[PDB]
PDB file of C-alpha atoms in Angstrom:
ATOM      1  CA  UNK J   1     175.271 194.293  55.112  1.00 42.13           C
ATOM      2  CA  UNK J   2     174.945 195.119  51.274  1.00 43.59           C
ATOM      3  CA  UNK J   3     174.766 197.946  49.233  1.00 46.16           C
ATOM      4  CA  UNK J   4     172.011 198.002  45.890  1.00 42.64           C
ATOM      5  CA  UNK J   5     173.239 198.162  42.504  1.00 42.96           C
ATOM      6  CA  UNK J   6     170.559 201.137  43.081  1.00 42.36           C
ATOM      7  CA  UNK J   7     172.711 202.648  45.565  1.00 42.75           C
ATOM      8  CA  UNK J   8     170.127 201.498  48.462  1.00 39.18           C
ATOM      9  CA  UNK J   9     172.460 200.663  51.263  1.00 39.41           C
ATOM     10  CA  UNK J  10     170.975 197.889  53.755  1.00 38.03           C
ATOM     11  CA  UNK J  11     171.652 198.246  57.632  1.00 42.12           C
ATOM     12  CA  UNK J  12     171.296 195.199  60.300  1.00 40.65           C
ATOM     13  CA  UNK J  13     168.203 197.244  61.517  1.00 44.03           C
ATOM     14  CA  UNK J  14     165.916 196.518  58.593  1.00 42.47           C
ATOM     15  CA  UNK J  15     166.438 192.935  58.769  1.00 41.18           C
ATOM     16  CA  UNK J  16     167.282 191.953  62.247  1.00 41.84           C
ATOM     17  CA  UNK J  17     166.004 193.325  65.595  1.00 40.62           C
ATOM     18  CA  UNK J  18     169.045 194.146  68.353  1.00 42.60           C
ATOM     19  CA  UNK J  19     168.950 194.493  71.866  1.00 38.85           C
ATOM     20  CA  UNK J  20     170.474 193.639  75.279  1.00 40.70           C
ATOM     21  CA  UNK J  21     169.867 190.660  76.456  1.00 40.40           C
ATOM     22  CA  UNK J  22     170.998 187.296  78.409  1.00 43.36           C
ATOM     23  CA  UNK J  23     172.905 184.893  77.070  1.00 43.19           C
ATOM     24  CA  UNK J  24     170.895 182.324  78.266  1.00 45.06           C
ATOM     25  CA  UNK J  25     167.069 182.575  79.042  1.00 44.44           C
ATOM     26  CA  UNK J  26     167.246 178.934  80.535  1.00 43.54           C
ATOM     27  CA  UNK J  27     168.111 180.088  84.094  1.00 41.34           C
ATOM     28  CA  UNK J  28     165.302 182.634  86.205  1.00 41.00           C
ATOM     29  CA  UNK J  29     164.862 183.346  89.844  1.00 37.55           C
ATOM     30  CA  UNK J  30     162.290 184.411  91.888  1.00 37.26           C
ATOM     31  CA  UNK J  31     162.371 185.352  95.522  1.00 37.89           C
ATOM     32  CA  UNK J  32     159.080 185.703  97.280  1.00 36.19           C
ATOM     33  CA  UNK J  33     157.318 186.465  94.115  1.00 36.49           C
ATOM     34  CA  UNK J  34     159.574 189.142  92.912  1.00 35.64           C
ATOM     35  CA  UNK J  35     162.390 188.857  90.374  1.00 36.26           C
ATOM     36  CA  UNK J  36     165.813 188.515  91.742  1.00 34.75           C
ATOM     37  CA  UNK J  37     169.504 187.202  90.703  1.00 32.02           C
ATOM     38  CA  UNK J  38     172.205 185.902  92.697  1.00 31.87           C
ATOM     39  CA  UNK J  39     174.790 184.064  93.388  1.00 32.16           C
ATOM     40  CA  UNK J  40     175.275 180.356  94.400  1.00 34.62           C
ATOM     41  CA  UNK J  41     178.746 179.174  95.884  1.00 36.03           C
ATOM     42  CA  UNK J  42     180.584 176.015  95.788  1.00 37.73           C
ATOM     43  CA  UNK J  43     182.994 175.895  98.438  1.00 35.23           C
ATOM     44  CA  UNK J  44     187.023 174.151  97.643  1.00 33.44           C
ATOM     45  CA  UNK J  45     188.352 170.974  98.773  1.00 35.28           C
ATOM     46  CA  UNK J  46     190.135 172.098 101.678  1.00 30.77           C
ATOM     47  CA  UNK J  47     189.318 175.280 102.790  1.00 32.65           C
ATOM     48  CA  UNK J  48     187.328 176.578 105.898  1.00 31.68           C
ATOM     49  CA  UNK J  49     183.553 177.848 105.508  1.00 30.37           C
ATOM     50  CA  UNK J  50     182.947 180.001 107.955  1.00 32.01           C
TER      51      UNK J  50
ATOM     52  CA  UNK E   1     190.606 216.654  92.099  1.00 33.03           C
ATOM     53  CA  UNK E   2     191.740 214.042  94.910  1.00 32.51           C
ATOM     54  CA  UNK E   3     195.520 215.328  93.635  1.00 33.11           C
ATOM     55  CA  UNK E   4     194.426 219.525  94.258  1.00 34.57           C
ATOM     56  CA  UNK E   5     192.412 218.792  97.497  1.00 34.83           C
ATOM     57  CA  UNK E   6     195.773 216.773  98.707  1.00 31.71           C
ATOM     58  CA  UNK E   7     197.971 219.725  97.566  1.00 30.35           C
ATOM     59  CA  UNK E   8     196.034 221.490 100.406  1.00 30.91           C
ATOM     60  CA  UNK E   9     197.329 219.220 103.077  1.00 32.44           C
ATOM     61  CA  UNK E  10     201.104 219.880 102.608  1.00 36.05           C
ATOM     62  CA  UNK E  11     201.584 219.453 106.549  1.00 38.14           C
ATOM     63  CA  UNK E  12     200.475 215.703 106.990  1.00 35.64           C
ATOM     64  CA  UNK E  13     200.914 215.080 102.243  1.00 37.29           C
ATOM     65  CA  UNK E  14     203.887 215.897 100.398  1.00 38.37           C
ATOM     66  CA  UNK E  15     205.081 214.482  96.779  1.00 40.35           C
ATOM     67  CA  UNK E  16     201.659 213.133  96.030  1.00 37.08           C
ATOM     68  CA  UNK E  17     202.025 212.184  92.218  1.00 36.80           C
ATOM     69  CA  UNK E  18     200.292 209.756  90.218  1.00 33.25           C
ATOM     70  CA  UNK E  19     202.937 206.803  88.839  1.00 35.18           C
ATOM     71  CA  UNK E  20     200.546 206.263  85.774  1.00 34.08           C
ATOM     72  CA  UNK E  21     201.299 207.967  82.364  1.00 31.65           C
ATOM     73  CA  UNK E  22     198.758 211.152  81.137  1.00 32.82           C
ATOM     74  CA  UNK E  23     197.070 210.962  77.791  1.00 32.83           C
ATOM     75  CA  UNK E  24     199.173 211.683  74.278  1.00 31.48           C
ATOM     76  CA  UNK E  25     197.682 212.137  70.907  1.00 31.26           C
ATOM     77  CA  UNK E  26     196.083 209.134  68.954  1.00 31.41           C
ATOM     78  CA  UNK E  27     195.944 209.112  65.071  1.00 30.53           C
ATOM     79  CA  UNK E  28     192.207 208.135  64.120  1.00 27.91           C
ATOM     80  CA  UNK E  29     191.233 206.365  60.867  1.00 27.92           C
ATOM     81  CA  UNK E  30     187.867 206.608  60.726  1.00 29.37           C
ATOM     82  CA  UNK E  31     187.280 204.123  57.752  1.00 29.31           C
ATOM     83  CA  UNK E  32     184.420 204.009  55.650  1.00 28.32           C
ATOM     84  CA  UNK E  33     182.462 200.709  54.670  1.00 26.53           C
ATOM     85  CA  UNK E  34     180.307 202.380  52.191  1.00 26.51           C
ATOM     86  CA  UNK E  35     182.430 203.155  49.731  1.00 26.64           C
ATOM     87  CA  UNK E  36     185.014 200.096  50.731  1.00 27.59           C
ATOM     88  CA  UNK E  37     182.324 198.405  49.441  1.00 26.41           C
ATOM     89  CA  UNK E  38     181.234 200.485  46.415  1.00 26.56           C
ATOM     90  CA  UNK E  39     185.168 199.914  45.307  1.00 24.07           C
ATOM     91  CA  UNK E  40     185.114 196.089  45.951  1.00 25.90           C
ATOM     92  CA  UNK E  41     187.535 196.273  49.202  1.00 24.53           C
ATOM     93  CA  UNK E  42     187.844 193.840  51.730  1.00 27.16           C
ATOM     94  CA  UNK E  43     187.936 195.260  54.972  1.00 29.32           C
ATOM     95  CA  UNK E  44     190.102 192.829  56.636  1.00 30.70           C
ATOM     96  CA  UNK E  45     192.633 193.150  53.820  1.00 31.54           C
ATOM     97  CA  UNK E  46     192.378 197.091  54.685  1.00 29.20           C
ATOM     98  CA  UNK E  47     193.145 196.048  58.405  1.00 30.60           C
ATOM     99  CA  UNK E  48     195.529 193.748  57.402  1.00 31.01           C
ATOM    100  CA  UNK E  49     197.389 195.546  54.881  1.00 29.78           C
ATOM    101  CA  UNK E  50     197.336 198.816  57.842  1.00 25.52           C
TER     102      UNK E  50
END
């Protein structure tokens, strides 16, 4: 990010924690108490659902 | 290893190439930020200017 007239060179590390994670916390699911994902489908205008 | 262990079926395989292309020699530029920066150098016009 910056290097110090000093010749201290600063990483994203010291000022910023990084990790993997969502990119967006709004949406959780649960299925019978434990955690899950998955996959809800919206059929076409048209088209045959079985 | 699919290709060798079809090489042993000649009798029911024959001609069984890929149609793909096999890996050539790259020329790596493994630029430094560091010193970029201890020079006043704007990566992007190093990318640009590459």
């Amino acid at each position: 990010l910056k290097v110090n007239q000093d010749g201290s060179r600063v990483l994203l590390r010291d000022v910023a924690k990084i990790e993997l994670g969502g990119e967006n916390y709004d949406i959780i699911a649960e299925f019978n108490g434990q955690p899950a994902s998955g996959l809800g489908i919206k059929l076409a205008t048209g088209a045959n659902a079985l | 290893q699919l290709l060798a262990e079809a090489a042993k079926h000649p009798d029911m395989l024959t001609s069984v190439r890929p149609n793909g292309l096999e890996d050539t020699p790259q020329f790596k530029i493994d630029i430094d930020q560091e010193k970029a920066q201890a020079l006043g150098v704007s990566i992007n016009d190093i990318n640009t200017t590459l």
